Amino acid sequence: IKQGIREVILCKDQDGKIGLRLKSIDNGIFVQLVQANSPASLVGLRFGDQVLQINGENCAGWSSDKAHKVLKQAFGEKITMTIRDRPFERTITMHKDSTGHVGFIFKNGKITSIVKDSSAARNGLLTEHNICEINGQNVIGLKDSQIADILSTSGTVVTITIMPAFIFEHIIKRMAPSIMKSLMDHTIPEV
């Protein structure tokens, strides 16, 4: 989670999509969903990102509907966006033990308990937090099994990006869980 603004230039695909859905939160605009294999995924927009401007114009106070509206009504040539990096999220680094544990319990993405003497404990991982990413990979909507798998497949060092459930639950609100499982980009970034 970078402590700054950045600018991205987008470019509508063949079909005029950018692969993005936006949600209005506390009078800003935030990324609800990034589609795999989209301009938005390529330029590296992330779930939880804040859109400050689109094509120079400020986003504050906009409705989800109007933000979508704007995106359609724009000379796709290039769309310029100004992005505060996942403002509602923070990242914990952790280390696996001899028995390959970081030391917490989660359910539906949400962390429900921390284990005594764990690395989860030493680093102050918090409960009532929905898991957003792991080692830089968005794991939202995956099953608990596949999340467990990623934590298993991951090295000893494990980096998790978490968000307060209340905020998480308000971002994903009005989006079907299948779409998150299906369409939300769950891939490592390209170089």
Swiss-Prot record:
What mutagenesis or variant effect is reported for K107A? Answer: Disruption of the cooperative binding of C-terminal peptides from FZD7 and phosphatidylinositol-4,5-bisphosphate
Q: How is the protein altered post-translationally, as described in the entry? A: Phosphorylated on tyrosine residues.
Q: How does it sit in the membrane?
A: Peripheral membrane protein
Domain named PDZ: residues: 7-86, 91-166
According to its UniProt record, where is this protein located? Cell junction, Focal adhesion; Cell junction, Adherens junction; Cell membrane; Endoplasmic reticulum membrane
Question: How is this protein induced?
Answer: By IFNG/IFN-gamma in melanoma cells.
GO molecular-function terms, A-Z = cytoskeletal anchor activity; frizzled binding; identical protein binding; interleukin-5 receptor binding; phosphatidylinositol-4,5-bisphosphate binding; protein heterodimerization activity; protein sequestering activity; syndecan binding
* Keyword line: Acetylation, Cell junction, Cell membrane, Cytoplasm, Cytoskeleton, Endoplasmic reticulum, Lipid-binding, Membrane, Nucleus, Phosphoprotein, Repeat, Secreted
Q: Which GO terms describe its cellular component?
A: adherens junction; azurophil granule lumen; blood microparticle; cytoplasm; cytoskeleton; cytosol; endoplasmic reticulum membrane; extracellular exosome
Its GO biological process annotations read:
actin cytoskeleton organization; chemical synaptic transmission; intracellular signal transduction; negative regulation of receptor internalization; negative regulation of transcription by RNA polymerase II; positive regulation of cell growth; positive regulation of cell migration; positive regulation of cell population proliferation
Q: Which residues bind a 1,2-diacyl-sn-glycero-3-phospho-(1D-myo-inositol-4,5-bisphosphate)?
A: N108, K143, D144
Tissue range of expression? Expressed in lung cancers, including adenocarcinoma, squamous cell carcinoma and small-cell carcinoma (at protein level). Widely expressed. Expressed in fetal kidney, liver, lung and brain. In adult highest expression in heart and placenta.
Oligomeric form and interacting partners: Monomer and homodimer. Interacts with SDC1, SDC2, SDC3, SDC4, NRXN2, EPHA7, EPHB1, NF2 isoform 1, TGFA and IL5RA. Interacts with NFASC and PTPRJ. Interacts with SDCBP2. Interacts with PDCD6IP. Forms a complex with PDCD6IP and SDC2. Interacts (via C-terminus) with TGFBR1. Binds to FZD7; this interaction is increased by inositol trisphosphate (IP3). Interacts with SMO.
- Summarize the protein's role: Multifunctional adapter protein involved in diverse array of functions including trafficking of transmembrane proteins, neuro and immunomodulation, exosome biogenesis, and tumorigenesis. Positively regulates TGFB1-mediated SMAD2/3 activation and TGFB1-induced epithelial-to-mesenchymal transition (EMT) and cell migration in various cell types. May increase TGFB1 signaling by enhancing cell-surface expression of TGFR1 by preventing the interaction between TGFR1 and CAV1 and subsequent CAV1-dependent internalization and degradation of TGFR1.
Its recorded name reads Syntenin-1
Biological source species: Homo sapiens
User: Which part of the entire sequence is included in the shown chain?
Assistant: 108 to 298 of 298
